[PDB]
Write a protein that binds this ligand. Structure first.
Ligand code: SF4
Lengths: 66, 100, 212, 111, 335, 148, 101, 191
């Protein structure tokens, strides 16, 4: 086990990229992108479990233009 | 003398997986606040056919591991063991043993 | 006197003090209970279809975290879904007694709040299920919409997060037992388990089949 | 069979309690008032209902052993427990995690 | 206190392996009904396996009235210890093995035989009528699907000249995908896969009692932390049985040269820092890419077949899976 | 964010009348009526649409008319005024009480300021009127909200 | 642990099986007490194979056949008790003394 | 590193003899039957300590997984809730069995210690699944083929002695003089 060089590549910096990827294309992704989407969560799961209560996917408040 | 290799971690892993329920049920212990079954002889009958066939599997595991270093005469002899215990299997279907 | 049905003053001081860490480990306790409370699959009357529609596709039940479990030992939440009569009254308090100790009943529909249309004259409906079990969240409507039942769960998640970890002594029932000996004559039971092979169906009785 | 009557403030069973596991008898009746603690009791009114519990078992000791008769007693205890509240003897609990006030609201006497 | 480094690193990937399979159950089974799944907890449901199991700790694990006390508590501790001990077999990675036992696909079938006693001392001790009817039925289902599963491993041990699970997956590492055992044992793999699915998955199990032959199964009177061992101890065996599919038949840690285009389930550019960590952890764990395809399959196969009754469940293991398990062993031999 | 300190306790004693903007699924509102209640403040969570005119309900005795359902007379139950009755019960060894109103977004703008100008005129008494929805729970005094 | 301590373990595991073979009143507890005797002849047998004739184990082969016999003797053995229980509705070894003299 | 093979021997040798007293002396038979798996697992722990990796893995499969499941089904089938507790039935013949069992034990220990065993200092088990399988098909071949004949007979016999007689229970087949169905024709009679 690497102390802090290769561990942070798996635990922190790459799962933070997937959470940006998970927010953007999850409901609008195609039939091929969705099956690849479930693989990165089933692989970076001890990474994505750490930065779980820091990011909230709640929708942005609307502007009420009417 | 102990010439088995690979069993040094088996005694440690036997204790730690045994410490998975006894410590978690104790970790929960500090955080928490006309009776008839009918005698149907099929629970015995499904288990008898297991014992006759859990023993057949044990007898074929030295054969299967040491097969490709034995030859054909040890395959004719090991075919008698399988072909007889097939007749034990046809006897169980036909005599309604494992019917449920 | 002065006040009918008075409120007893809290003489206990409620010294509920803790540091930051024990209220940080209390946030994990309260979050993990409100977010995954499993409902009992209970339903009697018309307000079960309103709740069974929420299990399905158009409204997701298991989106707040509610996986329905059909036995009172695994489940904790129980949505009182439909009219309770005089029968099904002790079959419901038996359903409530056999649950692990943070239970949180919610009421549902106008019939478990007051006995909605069966308050005026019905000879067997328990008017409101708070006569039987303590309810956490009420919910009127006849039936409530399946958008409105997920509102009462939203109000219930506001009730779990208030709950304190060291106030778990009131989550266990008390024992104010008494014992009296009666002089009632015991009777044999009425409903034994025989319908077809009862010896009253196989033949018509005498002195009545002559004119039959 | 364990005939019983389980209301909210009253749990009349037909049998005597031997350390949690109730055994059904033919002679005795167990009663525990307020298993959930909604009303904050005191020393006197836990003994006042014994003047109504042992009265109602003795006065109705000529009828059958049905759950209609165990309910008919319990519907008179829970109408005596309310008459304690409308006389102001006992009061509601405030440590209780639920606050539905099932026996009416607190109200003042004559405006 | 677990001073072995390999023994702690395995106990985490046997713990995070459960929470993957719980979360994958609530999102694949919610995809096939056209609903969201558990939102609102974590980002999109990632904390649904944490929070479902953490609430099971904080409940009053109370007994029923007249029950055996020492067998109620020891009920779940016999179902889950041998399926947790038998993770000592699976050698995920080229440069990782916890213990090289000279057998181990025979030690796994040995240890998986103790689990019918754990369904027996839990069905008996909970002490109502509908848990003896459900306990004796759940015990008589791991019985029937155990001889077909032990003969699928007999065939793949004939080809491998051993039972050591490194020596099995080393015989499939010479040709990458040409020498996986599925291509040479296409009828002993379905015998493994149907029998393993019929010992731990949720299609051939009487726990959802929408058919009402019993009340709610054998885990009816269980609650709290004891129920968490029957629930978060069923996916421990779903992962291990899916691991041993991707160890025995499909080659564990075996795959050709990764130097390809962007269509290799990864990013875009060739030499990024993102593909070097999608290779090096794959140079540490290659099998849990394969092992989370059958967990993806076993969840998806739950909604594909109808709920077969117990009268036809044991008319599958004895009358079909065992005779096919025999003739596969002879066909794997010469005859 | 995640780790909340005790700033919600000192913000309520300073302003006197808060306004919480919680996520509309609930569950994260109530972690702030626990730090409030750990510091001696009791909490009376009422309902905002259920309250009538807050002059007649909070500080005055009000006649709650029960449902007669055709089988009774028109009774009038004169309940005691809620804020003065629930304060006389609580001993002065603790602090006052709050009124954690839920579904507060259906009170009129006049009844917001009446819940603002009453928490100063009444000593050791506060309100936390939960109003509106947001992605993250955040608070502000009611003095700024009625002018918004 | 030497060879001697396995044998005194096997010789003690035998004689608890004897005490259950003679004193037990359930018809099934005699069958479990028979299985203790058929393990003490296994614990004697592998222990004779490890320290004596270690290179070619003739004891661990002979230890295999004792398990398969006793598994086949307890499969026959419980079939007999289950034939008695359908006729005589108890299992009491002080109730099967009708073939006395 | 060697004293942890002695401590784990005496902790397994005390795991069997406290469970072996449990399968004999305990008052309930289901608690007696479940502890029989404690005997069979702990004995299987000793076989690994005696360098018998295959005979241990074949014992958890048969004795714990097949025989002990066979015992437990055959006790849930006979409970009947009628123990009748006639403990002083006729005499104190449970103390006469404590003398022969203690007599055999003191007899065997005198035999074990004083007998010179010719223990060899060679390393055992050169992969004892290969030299146990070259015994099944060279030397121990005829006991291996007779184990197949024994097991087939044990399935013919144990089925016909435990199956239900739902084919024809009232079957008066024939007669010279009267015979009941499925019974030996020598009718019971007292002189
Ligand atoms: S109030 Fe009406 S809709 Fe609601 S449960 Fe009763 S009958 Fe059904």
């Amino acid at each position: 086990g690497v102390y802090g060089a290769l561990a942070g590549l798996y635990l922190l910096v790459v799962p933070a990229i997937v959470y940006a990827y998970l927010n953007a294309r999850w409901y609008v992704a195609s039939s091929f992108e969705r099956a690849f989407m479930y693989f990165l969560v089933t692989f970076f799961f001890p990474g994505l479990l750490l930065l779980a209560p820091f990011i909230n996917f709640r929708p942005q408040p609307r502007s009420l233009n009417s | 003398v102990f010439v088995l290799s690979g069993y040094e971690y088996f005694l440690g892993f036997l204790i730690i997986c045994s410490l998975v329920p006894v410590l978690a049920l104790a970790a929960s212990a500090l955080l928490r606040p006309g009776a008839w079954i009918q005698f149907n002889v099929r629970y015995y009958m499904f288990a008898l056919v297991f014992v006759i066939f859990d023993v057949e599997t044990v007898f074929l595991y030295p054969w299967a591991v040491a097969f490709h270093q034995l030859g054909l005469l040890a395959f004719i002899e090991a075919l008698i063991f399988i072909a007889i215990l097939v007749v034990a299997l046809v006897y169980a279907w036909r005599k309604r043993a494992l019917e449920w | 006197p002065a006040i009918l049905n008075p409120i007893a003053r809290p003489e206990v001081p409620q010294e509920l003090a803790e540091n930051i860490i024990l209220t940080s480990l209390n946030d994990v306790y309260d979050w993990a209970r409100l977010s995954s409370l499993w409902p009992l699959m209970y339903g009697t009357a018309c307000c079960f279809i309103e709740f069974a529609a929420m299990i399905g596709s158009r409204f997701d039940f298991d989106r707040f975290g509610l996986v329905p479990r059909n036995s009172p030992r695994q489940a904790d939440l129980i949505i009182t879904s439909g009219t309770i009569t005089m029968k099904m009254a002790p079959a419901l308090v038996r359903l409530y007694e056999q649950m692990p100790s943070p239970k949180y009943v919610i009421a549902m529909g106008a019939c478990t709040i007051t006995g909605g249309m069966f308050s005026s004259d019905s000879y067997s409906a328990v008017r409101g299920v708070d006569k039987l079990i303590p309810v956490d969240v009420y919910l009127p409507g006849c039936p409530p919409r399946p958008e409105a039942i997920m509102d009462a769960i939203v109000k219930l998640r506001k009730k779990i997060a208030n709950e304190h970890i060291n106030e778990r002594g009131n989550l266990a029932q008390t024992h104010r037992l008494f014992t009296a000996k009666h002089k009632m004559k015991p009777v044999p039971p009425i409903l034994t388990g025989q319908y077809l092979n009862a010896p009253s169906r196989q033949a018509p009785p005498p002195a009545l089949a002559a004119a039959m | 069979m364990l005939l019983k009557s389980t209301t909210r403030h009253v749990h009349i069973y037909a049998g005597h309690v031997v350390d949690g596991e109730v055994h059904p008898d033919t002679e005795t009746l167990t009663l525990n008032v307020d298993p959930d603690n909604e009303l904050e009791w005191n020393e006197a009114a836990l003994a006042k209902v014994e003047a109504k519990f042992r009265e109602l078992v003795a006065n109705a000791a000529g009828e059958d052993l049905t759950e209609y008769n165990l309910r008919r007693i319990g519907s008179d205890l829970e109408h005596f427990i309310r008459s304690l509240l409308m006389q102001g003897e006992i009061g509601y609990n405030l440590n209780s995690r639920v606050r539905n006030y099932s026996l009416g609201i607190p109200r003042v006497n004559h405006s | 206190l677990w001073l072995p480094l390999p023994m702690l690193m395995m106990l985490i990937v046997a713990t995070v392996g459960v929470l993957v399979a719980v979360w994958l159950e609530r999102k694949i089974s919610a995809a096939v009904q056209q609903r969201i799944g558990p939102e609102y907890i974590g980002p999109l449901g990632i904390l649904a396996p944490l929070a479902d199991g953490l609430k099971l700790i904080f409940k009053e694990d109370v007994l029923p009235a007249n029950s055996d006390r020492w067998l109620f508590t020891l009920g779940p501790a016999v179902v889950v210890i041998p399926v947790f001990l038998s993770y000592i077999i699976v050698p995920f990675g080229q440069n990782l093995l916890i213990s090289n036992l000279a057998m181990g696909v025979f030690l796994w079938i040995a240890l998986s035989s103790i689990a019918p006693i754990g369904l027996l001392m839990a069905g008996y001790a909970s002490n109502n009528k509908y848990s003896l009817l459900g306990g004796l039925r759940a015990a008589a289902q791991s019985i029937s699907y155990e001889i077909p599963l032990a003969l699928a491993v007999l065939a793949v041990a004939m080809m491998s000249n051993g039972l050591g699970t490194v020596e099995i997956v080393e015989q499939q590492s010479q040709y990458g995908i040409l020498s996986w055992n599925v291509w040479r044992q296409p009828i002993g793999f379905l015998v493994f896969w149907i029998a393993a699915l019929a010992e731990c998955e949720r299609l051939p199990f009487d726990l959802p009692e929408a058919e009402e032959e019993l009340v709610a199964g054998y885990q009816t009177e269980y609650a709290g932390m004891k129920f968490a061992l029957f629930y978060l101890g069923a996916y421990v065996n779903l992962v291990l049985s899916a691991l041993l599919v991707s160890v025995l038949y499909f080659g564990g840690w075996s795959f050709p040269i990764p130097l390809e285009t962007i269509a290799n389930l990864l990013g875009v550019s060739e030499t990024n820092p993102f593909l070097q960590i999608a290779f090096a952890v794959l140079g540490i764990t290659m099998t849990l890419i394969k092992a989370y395809f059958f967990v993806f399959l076993a969840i998806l196969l739950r909604w594909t077949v109808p709920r077969v009754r117990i009268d036809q469940l044991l008319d599958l293991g004895w009358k079909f899976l065992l005779p096919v398990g025999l003739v596969n062993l002879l066909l794997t031999a010469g005859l | 964010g995640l780790l909340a300190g005790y700033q919600f306790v000192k913000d309520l004693e300073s302003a006197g009348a808060l306004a919480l903007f919680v996520p509309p699924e609930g569950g994260f509102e109530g972690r702030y009526q626990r730090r409030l209640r750990s510091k001696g403040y009791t909490t009376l969570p009422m309902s905002a649409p259920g309250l009538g005119d807050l002059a007649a309900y909070l500080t005055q005795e009000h006649g709650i008319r029960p449902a007669h359902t055709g089988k009774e007379d028109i009774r009038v139950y004169f309940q005691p005024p809620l804020v003065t009755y629930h304060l006389e019960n609580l001993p002065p060894n603790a602090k006052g009480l709050v009124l954690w109103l839920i579904d507060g977004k259906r009170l009129s703008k006049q009844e917001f300021a009446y819940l603002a100008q009453l928490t100063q005129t009444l000593p050791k008494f506060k309100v936390v009127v939960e109003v509106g929805g947001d992605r993250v729970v955040r608070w502000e005094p009611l003095a700024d909200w009625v002018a918004a | 642990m030497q060879l001697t301590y396995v044998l005194i373990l096997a010789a003690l595991l035998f004689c608890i099986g004897i005490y259950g073979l003679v004193t037990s009143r359930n018809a099934v507890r005699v069958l479990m007490s028979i299985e203790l005797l058929l393990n003490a002849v296994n614990l004697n047998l592998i222990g004779f194979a490890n320290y004596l004739d270690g290179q070619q184990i003739k004891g661990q082969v002979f230890a295999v056949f004792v398990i398969t016999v006793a598994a086949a003797e307890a499969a026959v053995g419980l079939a007999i008790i289950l034939a008695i229980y359908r006729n005589r509705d108890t299992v009491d070894m002080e109730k099967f003394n009708l073939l006395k003299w | 590193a060697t004293l942890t093979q002695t401590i784990t021997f005496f902790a397994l040798a005390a795991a069997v003899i406290i469970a072996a007293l449990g399968v004999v002396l305990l008052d309930n038979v289901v608690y007696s039957a479940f502890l029989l798996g404690g005997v069979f697992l702990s004995i299987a722990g000793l076989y690994i300590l005696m360098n018998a990796d295959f005979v241990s893995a074949a014992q958890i499969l048969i004795y714990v997984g097949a025989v002990n499941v066979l015992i437990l089904f055959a006790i849930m089938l006979v409970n009947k809730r009628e123990t009748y507790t006639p403990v002083p039935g006729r005499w104190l013949r449970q103390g006469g069995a404590a003398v022969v069992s203690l007599g055999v034990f003191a007899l065997l220990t005198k035999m074990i210690l004083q007998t010179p065993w010719q223990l060899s200092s060679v390393p055992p088990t050169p992969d004892s699944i290969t030299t146990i399988g070259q015994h099944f098909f060279s030397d121990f071949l005829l006991p291996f083929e007779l184990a197949s004949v024994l097991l087939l007979m044990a399935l013919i016999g144990a089925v016909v002695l435990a199956r239900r007689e739902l084919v024809l229970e009232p079957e008066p087949i024939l007669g010279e003089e009267v015979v009941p169905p499925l019974e030996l024709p020598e009718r019971p009679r007292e002189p």
